[model samples]
Target chain A: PCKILKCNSEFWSATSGSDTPEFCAALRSYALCTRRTARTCRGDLAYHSAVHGIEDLMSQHNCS
Target chain B: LKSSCKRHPLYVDFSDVGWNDWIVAPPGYHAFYCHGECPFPLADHLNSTNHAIVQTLVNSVNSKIPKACCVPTELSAISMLYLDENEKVVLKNYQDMVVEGCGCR
Candidate 1:
């Protein structure tokens, strides 16, 4: 529970228009983790939004 | 005034108003007005954190709790304002949330 929460917060802090390759990879990993445990974890919209937001950031940063 | 409204990010200046007050707009105007006024890009940045929080809260409440809560009402409200055909498509491109007709005249 706290793991997801902390991961989400960290992911958010990493994407403030200064995303790096490591952050991008971390976001994808965290987003996938959140999605897998979505029903059990807290925050459906947050996870969904984060998933989408990560995609946006990936494109914005052109991360591979 | 119209130019000013279009230029401002939030569109309206609520700064001068006191608390617990009301505002009004003509029919079929609010959607168009907000579309022209609300800066979607800025809103996206502002709402990013809250969107995550909302998802977490919704998940926590629904997991063990019998009653079901939902995403922030503001998302739906903002979705409604951007309902014109082109605007709908534009909104969909940026937002993962559902968007539908506003049912406004």
Candidate 2:
């Protein structure tokens, strides 16, 4: 029931072999941060930006 | 950081009525709504409004004994968000505050 699950679900549901290194790195960092601080994930701008960037990149690349 | 503003999708020139008018202009002009339905323009109004809302949200969270910290590097990632008139005022206010560093600790 973690909010990160939404991100993970979206990531996995998208097309494989289409992720750029930048996107994967961003996703990994975001996912790791979210998992580590699930309860305290409130004000981390860097993390949120990473997640947002990943989503933008995925959508731009037609990953879905 | 000012340079980053250039990359913003909703960036506008206040002096240019065409840009402002187009953002949330009437049916004759080319306008794109925020959230696909927002009546206000994103650059002038909606951006400021959302900025204030986010600022208040951040302040409220930070006021807690165990502060919930979040500094927004960019606007909310919600799709199609646009700005209105009142929000434009807030955006100007927020911009001023950002320039002042607003009582940094």
Candidate 3:
């Protein structure tokens, strides 16, 4: 869905080039965006994978 | 791509991912994928949802809204006989690892 893609675009925009504070802010926004899209993307493997991927990134990045 | 998105054949080789070291059983297994179009007038067999139907309708008029995706509607499991952290053999059934069916939602 576009919602998923939109969030990905935003995620890369911030998490891609912009960085300095040791952790990325994009993870939080992307995580919440994914949560919002879950209603319609329930069975989507990409959606579920993104959830896991984001969680791993957040954990790896130590983003609280 | 094909006539419509259907379950495609895919073999997940444990050795390809370097899992052969621990997984001493079957070298690989089929981990299928469901892919296809979620076009208008979705068939009953597609297992479409009301929201997907509405989404398709809106997408028909406004291209901005994306059509519903074709993803696995139901999933089954596959057992893996491998080694545990202690190097002991272990067999486990991983759930939702196989696509049983597909739908538009």
Q: How many residue pairs clash in each candidate?
A: 5, 16, 2
Model 1 fnat? Answer: 0.06
State the lDDT at B79 in candidate 1: 29
Segments in model 2 whose C-alpha atoms lie over 4 Å from true places? A1-23, A42-54, A62-64, B5-105
lDDT of 2 by residue, B1-105 (tens): 011111112333433555343233221222222221111111121223444334434553464422122222233221122366565522211121112111101
DockQ of 1: 0.05
Off by over 4 Å in 1: A1-4, A13-23, A39-43, B1-105
lDDT of each: 0.38, 0.34, 0.71
Worst 10 residues of 3 chain B by lDDT: B39-48
Q: After superposition, which runs of candidate 3 have C-alpha atoms over 4 Å from their true positions?
A: A1-64
lDDT digits (tens) for residues A1-64 of candidate 3: 5366566556655654343355666677788998999897887644654576677566566766
lDDT of 3 at B8: 76
Query: On residues B53-87, what C-alpha lDDT tens digit does candidate 1 reach at each position?
Result: 44434544465522112222242243212345353
What is the TM-score of each predicted model, taking all chains together? 0.30, 0.23, 0.57
Candidate 1 per-residue lDDT over residues A1-64, each given as its tens digit: 4245555655545543243645566657766766666776554444454555556656776767
Alpha-carbon shift of residue B17 in model 2 (angstroms): 24
lDDT of 3 by residue, B26-63 (tens): 78888888888776334344566777867776785689
For candidate 1, what is the TM-score? 0.30
Q: Clash pairs of candidate 1?
A: A43-B55, A43-B56, A44-B55, A45-B55, A46-B55
